[PDB]
Amino acid sequence: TALVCDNGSGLVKAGFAGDDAPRAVFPSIVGRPRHQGVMVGMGQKDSYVGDEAQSKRGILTLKYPIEHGIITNWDDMEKIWHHTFYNELRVAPEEHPTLLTEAPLNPKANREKMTQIMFETFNVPAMYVAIQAVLSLYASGRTTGIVLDSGDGVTHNVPIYEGYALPHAIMRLDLAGRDLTDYLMKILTERGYSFVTTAEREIVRDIKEKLCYVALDFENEMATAASSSSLEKSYELPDGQVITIGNERFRCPETLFQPSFIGMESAGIHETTYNSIMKCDIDIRKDLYANNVMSGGTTMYPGIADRMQKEITALAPSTMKIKIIAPPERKYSVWIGGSILASLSTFQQMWITKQEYDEAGPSIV
Amino acid sequence: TTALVCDNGSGLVKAGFAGDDAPRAVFPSIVGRPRHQGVMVGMGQKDSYVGDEAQSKRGILTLKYPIEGIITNWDDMEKIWHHTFYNELRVAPEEHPTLLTEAPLNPKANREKMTQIMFETFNVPAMYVAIQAVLSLYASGRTTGIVLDSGDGVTHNVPIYEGYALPHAIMRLDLAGRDLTDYLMKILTERGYSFVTTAEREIVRDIKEKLCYVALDFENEMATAASSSSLEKSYELPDGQVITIGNERFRCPETLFQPSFIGMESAGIHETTYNSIMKCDIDIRKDLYANNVMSGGTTMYPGIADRMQKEITALAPSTMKIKIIAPPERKYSVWIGGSILASLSTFQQMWITKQEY
Amino acid sequence: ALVCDNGSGLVKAGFAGDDAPRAVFPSIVGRPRHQGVMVGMGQKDSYVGDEAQSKRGILTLKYPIEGIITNWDDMEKIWHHTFYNELRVAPEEHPTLLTEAPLNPKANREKMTQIMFETFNVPAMYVAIQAVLSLYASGRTTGIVLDSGDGVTHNVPIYEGYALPHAIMRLDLAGRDLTDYLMKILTERGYSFVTTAEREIVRDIKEKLCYVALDFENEMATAASSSSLEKSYELPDGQVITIGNERFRCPETLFQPSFIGMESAGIHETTYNSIMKCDIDIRKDLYANNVMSGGTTMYPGIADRMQKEITALAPSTMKIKIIAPPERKYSVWIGGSILASLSTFQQMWITKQEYDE
């Protein structure tokens, strides 16, 4: 078949057209040496990518080619695709049409660079670049809906109508899956104990993906912390230090509603949905209010939907009913709807071919 | 009578009286409680000891530091605090108002029990317990700013405005002074040395005071050290041999910014400073950025100020005046604040007297 | 006397006599995170213009003026900042002129009349509609205006030194939205501009690169054909942008509000539509004399393009002339200073005694 890729800022999901579950999901990690040298038993490898880089640490810088939804480093991104084809999917690029996905606001310079490389460094027989929030809406079973794709580096509000993104309302706030982790670390160190230690990244994001929740009411909750141990959730770190975390458990994911909790100045995701849905025509605003879908990584947290709804209930005039659809698959949707779309028959004449590239070049994308 | 002030951290207590500008009893807040039956090479055998003699006792008494930036062990704290008003300060509690400082985030449960003990086990006629770095900014002569308070155990950022450190933005980092010594210790160990016991460890910490520095740029420094001898700063070890050290000198305290050298990823002292200034709201930021203030035993490190001038500017949008203020007094400024503040006539009616309690 | 031009973004002040405005600054005030009362301690007034931009609060950045002044406290605050901060004069001594937006509420003028005489104690105040003045910088009493400052574009008809409300067409566009559009499109060529410091870089780019191309379609094609529209600009830090189609996309926004996503008609549609609302015969003088003012008429090409559309929209025998001064950006003040200097007609200057009454 053909291949599909969600290149995250820190999670690349890959596979084919026609499967409902991603064939390969590795972090977008690029590991480069802190000095040329070796590790005993291995030699000097070209670079690191993904799990391999991460699960060792020591010897490397551990960068990322994508930040905030946009591709910033390019050489590294190519190294990752090299690790997606032969290394993850066990294929040669030239045999298999590839689909990769971009951020809703993604620069035309970025897209030209991407479709360039795919037909030069890789030489794939057909490619597509698709659009993160929009594909998630396809996986969400809808032509139309303002989606809230909070990946790893950003949320993205996008008023999709009839299978099209409306650009002038496409909001994006620079606080998400990543900024939310490091904040959870420092706040446990504020509390009690040295929550500082390199591996404790992955430890204190595992905490993030479980014990955290978006409190439905911060004012009630910060006080409830001081009333009852109810909120306190314990966690055995691998060393056996049964710790317990309390108000900070929310005080972290709440950053999306109050950006002041990390340090962005912007008003929060409720208001960024409201202020985009306003940049739409008064008419398409109702459907947006009925098909509002959360997507990506940072949408995981207990409460994040109802919190949104409540918030947009304050923000909405009395009549307008807000309806948030939390997807079961949410961290994968952008892959899912890509595959299914790429297998939809007619779409065979809706790829970018090697041929129209050797003719039109990057300017087709 | 006059009031007393006693600042507590994970390492050095400072005790004294109000009025004086300089702390009286600075000692290791170390107790030593008997491990088993053992006899000193000197003294016979006796119970728990606080201070320098406990360091010389090391193998007969188990040695605790009662404060890990928060009071962990309650009896041990009291053990010191008797040794303070009595063996150090040479006075009695009943005559004497006393101020104890504290590390900012201190849980309510600690504070309630702290009030109890000193009115009861000790019986001071009135007392106060007070937020450390606010008293540093005060000893710094300021209504505002942000202290980076870092010493033997815990490191802090307090964005202060008009009396208050912004609570939610008081950033803590538990990488501080012991973390630095035990790194500097491990480096030299790898090279073929080994301390462990008592004297040699302390020697390694003295080395930290004399040879160590944080350089502005770690990659240009990483280079020059490994290139040419300029940095090769010697020391005369108590056996005889000169340990020459060039790279390790700056390498050791770099753990404040790049903590990953020991193995720590949570946000470095610089990044914590950017994010406390941000973790507030938005206008007061300037006179936080322009009054980054250093206090505590660790901020003693040379070069550290020039480096933060880089380290904040890098992230802070161009038109913010970054200025790092660091007092010469710095290791005691929480006491120096606390004396003057205790002595304040204006503050008399805030001495919680033994009747209200 | 003085002249002090006020609006949703920029405020120009000086004396009657001078050719060019003495002080020009942003109408931004900050209002506190709620410490204090309206009458009580603390800086209600706070921070105006650059001082408020530099930090941004907390003291939340209330622009008071949307052409129409929404809330009168913040205007008082600016007017303090003008006479006392910007000019450094004595308001009691120096009769002030202030410049009002056509379709200001009459009650809004009453409050302007009051705050001047009461809090500022100015001996006499005058107030004049920004449009007729825009024509007095072009030497006329009569004519159709397209003012396009930083806030709201303005299609104002004038007969014999008076504006005709029934035609005065607003468009919620100018200057600001014009840069915040430019930010979205620079993003397409990598340059996601984001900070306020970057919006100051971006605003220089508007003036240097962005220009009202005579036609939209023939222009699009030349861009797509050939690089000649594209021109590199070096960013102050060291970088260089290149911009092509986008260069004219950015001013085109006046003619096409669908670009930003606004339900409102382009300046060509509104200019005309205001003149149709004019008297069937006076229309001739107005058409014959269109005067166009503001930071967003500074755009090169704008006069000929306006003239092209109005000729294609007005009858074959319609004698139209557009007028923009080379000093157009400031014209409300230049028009104002002439009036404020007109010492013979003087009794227009309603005094403190013509207010004691």
Q: Which among C59, C195, C197 is the nearest to B283, CB-wise?
A: C59
B160 φ/ψ angles, rounded to the nearest 5 degrees: -90, 135
Cβ separation B282–C30 shorter than 8 A: no
Which residues of chain A neighbour B278 with C-beta distances below 8 Å? Answer: 262-264
Task: Tally B–C CB contacts below 8 A.
Answer: 24
Handedness of CA A276, A278, A281, A285 (dihedral sign): positive
**Which residue type is seen at C314?**
A
Question: What is the token pair recorded at C209?
Answer: 């690169």
In whole angstroms, give the CA distance from residue C290 to residue C306: 9
Cβ separation B282–C55 shorter than 8 A: yes
Question: What is the token pair recorded at C93?
Answer: 């001594």
The closest alpha carbon to B287, from B164, B169, B161, belongs to: B161
Which residues of chain B neighbour C57 with C-beta distances below 8 Å? Answer: 281-283
Where is B16: in which H helix or E strand? Answer: strand B12-17
Give the position of tokens 């949408």: A299
The chains found to touch C (3+ Cβ pairs under 8 angstroms) are A, B
Pairing of strands B4-7, B12-17: antiparallel
In whole angstroms, give the CA distance from residue C170 to residue C173: 9
Cβ separation A107–C261 shorter than 8 A: no
Angle separating helix axes A304-315 and A269-279, nearest 10 degrees: 50
| Cα nearest neighbour of A108 on chain C | C188
Angle separating helix axes B199-210 and B177-190, nearest 10 degrees: 100
3-state helix, strand, coil in chain C (%, to 5): 40, 20, 45
Chain B contact probe: residue of A56, A187, A194 with most B CBs at under 10 A: A194
Within 10 angstroms of residue C92's Cβ, the number of other Cβ atoms is 12
| Cα nearest neighbour of B289 on chain C | C55
> Dihedral through CA A219, CA A220, CA A221, CA A226, nearest 10?
100
Q: Do residues B5 and B318 make contact, with C-beta atoms less than 8 angstroms apart?
A: no
Pure H helices in chain C: 50-55, 72-80, 106-115, 130-136, 175-186, 196-209, 217-225, 246-252, 267-276, 283-287, 302-313, 331-341, 353-356
In whole angstroms, give the CA distance from residue C59 to residue C77: 13
Cβ separation B279–A260 shorter than 8 A: yes
The residues near B12 (Cβ < 8 Å, ≥ 6 apart) are B26, B27, B28, B29, B151, B152, B297, B331
Interface of C with A in 240-269 (CB under 8 A): 259-261, 263
The closest alpha carbon to A152, from A24, A259, A300, belongs to: A300
In whole angstroms, give the CA distance from residue B285 to residue B145: 9
Q: Do residues B60 and B27 make contact, with C-beta atoms less than 8 angstroms apart?
A: no
The separation between the first and the last C-alpha atoms of chain C, rounded to the nearest angstrom, is 22
A336 φ/ψ angles, rounded to the nearest 5 degrees: -65, -60
Per DSSP, C29 falls in state: B
Partner B contacted by C55 (CB < 8 A):
yes
Partner B contacted by C197 (CB < 8 A):
yes
> Dihedral through CA A122, CA A127, CA A131, CA A135, nearest 10?
-120
In whole angstroms, give the CA distance from residue B266 to residue A187: 10
Partner A contacted by C225 (CB < 8 A):
no
In whole angstroms, give the CA distance from residue B341 to residue B355: 22
Cβ separation C58–B284 shorter than 8 A: yes
Give the position of tokens 């950015």: C250
In whole angstroms, give the CA distance from residue B210 to residue B184: 12
In whole angstroms, give the CA distance from residue A269 to residue A271: 5
A219 φ/ψ angles, rounded to the nearest 5 degrees: -65, -50
Distance from CA of B55 to the nearest CA of A (A): 25
Strand partners, A172: A156
Which residues of chain C neighbour A110 with C-beta distances below 8 Å? Answer: 190
Partner B contacted by C195 (CB < 8 A):
yes
Within 10 angstroms of residue B291's Cβ, the number of other Cβ atoms is 20
CA R_g for chain B: 21
The residues near C130 (Cβ < 8 Å, ≥ 6 apart) are C5, C7, C99, C100, C101, C102, C147, C154, C293, C332
- What's the number of CA atoms in the CB half-sphere (13 Å) around residue C194? 11
Pairing of strands A126-131, A98-102: parallel
Which residues of chain C neighbour A109 with C-beta distances below 8 Å? Answer: 188-190
Chain C contact probe: residue of B283, B286, B288, B319 with most C CBs at under 10 A: B283
The closest alpha carbon to C28, from C4, C52, C7, belongs to: C52
Q: Do residues B232 and B239 make contact, with C-beta atoms less than 8 angstroms apart?
A: no
- What's the number of CA atoms in the CB half-sphere (13 Å) around residue B159? 24
Question: Rounded to 5 degrees, what angle do the CA atoms A87, A88, A92 make?
Answer: 60
Which residues of chain C neighbour A281 with C-beta distances below 8 Å? Answer: 263
Partner A contacted by B320 (CB < 8 A):
no
**Which residue type is seen at B28?**
P
In whole angstroms, give the CA distance from residue C55 to residue B280: 13
Which residues of chain B neighbour C59 with C-beta distances below 8 Å? Answer: 283
The chains found to touch B (3+ Cβ pairs under 8 angstroms) are A, C
Which residues of chain C neighbour A265 with C-beta distances below 8 Å? Answer: 56
Cβ separation C56–B283 shorter than 8 A: yes
Cβ separation C54–B319 shorter than 8 A: yes
In whole angstroms, give the CA distance from residue A207 to residue A185: 10
In whole angstroms, give the CA distance from residue C102 to residue C332: 12
Question: What is the token pair recorded at B51?
Answer: 């201070």
Pure H helices in C267-330: 267-276, 283-287, 302-313
Distance from CA of A80 to the nearest CA of C (A): 21
Q: Is B297 helix (H, G, I), strand (E, B) or coil?
A: helix
Cβ separation C190–A109 shorter than 8 A: yes
Per DSSP, C348 falls in state: G
Q: Do residues C87 and C23 make contact, with C-beta atoms less than 8 angstroms apart?
A: yes
| Cα nearest neighbour of C180 on chain A | A168
Measured CA to CA in angstroms, residue B281 lies from A251, B138, B284, C54, C57 at distances of 16, 22, 7, 14, 7
The residues near C236 (Cβ < 8 Å, ≥ 6 apart) are C201
In whole angstroms, give the CA distance from residue C241 to residue C208: 12
In whole angstroms, give the CA distance from residue A256 to residue C335: 50
Question: What is the token pair recorded at C3?
Answer: 């002249």
In whole angstroms, give the CA distance from residue A81 to residue A84: 5
Q: Do residues C220 and C213 make contact, with C-beta atoms less than 8 angstroms apart?
A: no
A309 φ/ψ angles, rounded to the nearest 5 degrees: -50, -55
Cβ separation C190–A107 shorter than 8 A: yes
Within 10 angstroms of residue B85's Cβ, the number of other Cβ atoms is 22
Measured CA to CA in angstroms, residue B331 lies from A36, B205, B257, B296, B300 at distances of 41, 16, 20, 4, 7
In whole angstroms, give the CA distance from residue A201 to residue C321: 69
- What's the number of CA atoms in the CB half-sphere (13 Å) around residue A361? 3
Within 10 angstroms of residue A106's Cβ, the number of other Cβ atoms is 20
Give the position of tokens 């080379």: C326
Where is B333: in which H helix or E strand? Answer: helix B333-343
Q: Do residues A276 and A159 make contact, with C-beta atoms less than 8 angstroms apart?
A: yes
The closest alpha carbon to A255, from A224, A292, A310, A212, belongs to: A212
The residues near A263 (Cβ < 8 Å, ≥ 6 apart) are B274, B275, B277, B278, B279
Q: What distance lies between CA C108 and its chain's CA centroid?
A: 19
Experimental method: cryo-EM
Partner A contacted by B281 (CB < 8 A):
yes
Q: Do residues B39 and B60 make contact, with C-beta atoms less than 8 angstroms apart?
A: yes
Burial A20-42 (b: 16+ CB within 10 A, else e): eebbbbbbbbbbbeeeeeeeeee
Within 10 angstroms of residue B122's Cβ, the number of other Cβ atoms is 18
Within 10 angstroms of residue A128's Cβ, the number of other Cβ atoms is 23
C139 φ/ψ angles, rounded to the nearest 5 degrees: 65, 45
Per DSSP, C143 falls in state: E
Pairing of strands B31-34, B49-50: antiparallel
Partner B contacted by A186 (CB < 8 A):
yes
Partner C contacted by B317 (CB < 8 A):
yes
The closest alpha carbon to C99, from C347, C342, C283, C335, belongs to: C335
In whole angstroms, give the CA distance from residue A132 to residue A147: 10
Handedness of CA B242, B245, B250, B256 (dihedral sign): negative
Which residues of chain B neighbour A261 with C-beta distances below 8 Å? Answer: 279
In whole angstroms, give the CA distance from residue B257 to residue B265: 10
CB-count exposure of residue A112 (10 Å: 0-12, 13-18, 19+) = middle
Return the biggest CA–CA distance within chain A: 69
Measured CA to CA in angstroms, residue B251 lies from A30, B201, B219 at distances of 25, 18, 11
In whole angstroms, give the CA distance from residue B314 to residue A179: 18
Q: What distance lies between CA A208 and its chain's CA centroid?
A: 15
CB-count exposure of residue B230 (10 Å: 0-12, 13-18, 19+) = exposed
Which residues of chain A neighbour B320 with C-beta distances below 8 Å? Answer: none
Which residues of chain A neighbour B280 with C-beta distances below 8 Å? Answer: 260
The closest alpha carbon to C146, from C271, C253, C256, belongs to: C271
Question: What is the token pair recorded at A231?
Answer: 């909120």
In whole angstroms, give the CA distance from residue B35 to residue B59: 8
In whole angstroms, give the CA distance from residue B125 to residue C50: 53
**Which residue type is seen at B251?**
R
Distance from CA of C306 to the nearest CA of A (A): 26
Cβ separation B281–C57 shorter than 8 A: yes
CB-count exposure of residue B285 (10 Å: 0-12, 13-18, 19+) = buried
Task: Tally A–B CB contacts below 8 A.
Answer: 63
Return the biggest CA–CA distance within chain B: 68
| Cα nearest neighbour of A106 on chain C | C188
Question: What is the token pair recorded at B36?
Answer: 């088993």
Q: What is the 3-state secondary structure (H, E, C) of chain A?
A: CCEEEEECCCCEEEEECCCCCCCEEECCCEECECCCCCCECECCCCCEECHHHHCCCCCECCECCEECCEECCCHHHHHHHHHHHHHHHCCCHHHCCEEEEECCCCCHHHHHHHHHHHHHHHCCCEEEEEEHHHHHHHHCCCCCEEEEEECCCCEEEEEEECCEECHHHCEEECCCCCHHHHHHHHHHHHHCCCCCCCCHHHHHHHHHCCCCCCCCCHHHHHHHHHHCHHHCEEEECCCCCEEEECCHHHHCHHHHCCHHHCCCCCCCHHHHHHHHHHHCCCCCHHHHHHCEEEEECHHHCCCHHHHHHHHHHHHCCCCCCCCEECCCCCCCHHHHHHHHHHHCHHHHHCCEEHHHHHHHCHHHC
Q: Do residues B289 and B321 make contact, with C-beta atoms less than 8 angstroms apart?
A: yes
Question: What is the token pair recorded at C341?
Answer: 């200097």
Distance from CA of B49 to the nearest CA of C (A): 51
Give the position of tokens 């004698």: C319
Distance from CA of B85 to the nearest CA of A (A): 29
In whole angstroms, give the CA distance from residue C169 to residue C146: 9
Cβ separation B174–A191 shorter than 8 A: no
Handedness of CA C131, C133, C136, C138 (dihedral sign): negative
In whole angstroms, give the CA distance from residue A28 to residue A10: 4
In whole angstroms, give the CA distance from residue C357 to residue C353: 6
| Cα nearest neighbour of C31 on chain B | B283
| Cα nearest neighbour of C52 on chain B | B283
The closest alpha carbon to C306, from C136, C146, C143, belongs to: C146
In whole angstroms, give the CA distance from residue C36 to residue C44: 8
- What's the number of CA atoms in the CB half-sphere (13 Å) around residue B189? 12
Q: Which among C47, C55, C197 is the nearest to B318, CB-wise?
A: C197
Within 10 angstroms of residue A226's Cβ, the number of other Cβ atoms is 11
Task: Tally A–C CB contacts below 8 A.
Answer: 25
In whole angstroms, give the CA distance from residue C109 to residue C92: 20
In whole angstroms, give the CA distance from residue A319 to residue A306: 18
Pairing of strands B12-17, C169-171: unpaired
In whole angstroms, give the CA distance from residue B245 to residue B188: 9
